[PDB]
Amino acid sequence: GMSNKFLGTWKLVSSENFDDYMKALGVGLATRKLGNLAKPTVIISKKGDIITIRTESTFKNTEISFKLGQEFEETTADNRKTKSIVTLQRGSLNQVQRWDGKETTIKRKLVNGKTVAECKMKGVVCTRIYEKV
Numbered sequence: 001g002m003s004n005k006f007l008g009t010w011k012l013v014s015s016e017n018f019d020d021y022m023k024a025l026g027v028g029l030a031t032r033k034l035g036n037l038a039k040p041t042v043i044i045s046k047k048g049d050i051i052t053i054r055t056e057s058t059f060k061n062t063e064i065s066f067k068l069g070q071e072f073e074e075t076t077a078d079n080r081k082t083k084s085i086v087t088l089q090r091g092s093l094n095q096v097q098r099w100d101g102k103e104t105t106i107k108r109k110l111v112n113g114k115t116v117a118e119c120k121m122k123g124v125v126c127t128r129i130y131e132k133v
């Protein structure tokens with residue numbers, strides 16, 4: 001049920017409050033330094049019911065494949081091992097990651113042709129805007 005408008009190759013154009021988001025995930029200073037400098041490309045694709053989100057950067061690459069509503073094991077860019085679930089709520093693609101009794105959410109939604117990712121951890125909100133390419 002995912003909008004095919006999500007599908008494509010997307011480039012970060014802006015990021016707000018990423019440091020405090022990373023810090024709340026427990027990312028350490030040197031890694032945050034490089035994370036803040038990174039300008040990743042996110043590639044969303046679909047094969048049958050299986051959706052893939054691939055993030056590419058000089059510093060770290062990541063890739064998850066999933067079916068909506070089906071928990072799956074994830075390795076995040078900061079090397080957290082999580083149980084994740086991705087869902088559709090109101091045209092938004094909502095990812096939840098759980099590990100060690102913690103939880104963070106990344107909500108990706110289409111806004112005037114951009115993908116806007118809202119990343120929440122413990123009341124810290126970070127917003128990152130992606131342009132299709």
Ligand SMILES: CCCCCCCCCCCCCCCC(=O)O
Pocket residue numbers: 022025027031032034035036038040042055056057059060061076077078106117119128
């Ligand atoms: C892949 C760029 C990040 C580089 C590594 C720095 C620490 C990662 C922090 C947690 C993962 C961030 C997820 C951001 C969501 C997004 O914008 O796609």
Ligand SMILES: [Cl-]
Pocket residue numbers: 037038039040057058059
């Ligand atoms: Cl980069």
Ligand SMILES: [Mg+2]
Pocket residue numbers: 017020
């Ligand atoms: Mg802040």
Ligand SMILES: [Mg+2]
Pocket residue numbers: 017019020
């Ligand atoms: Mg700050």
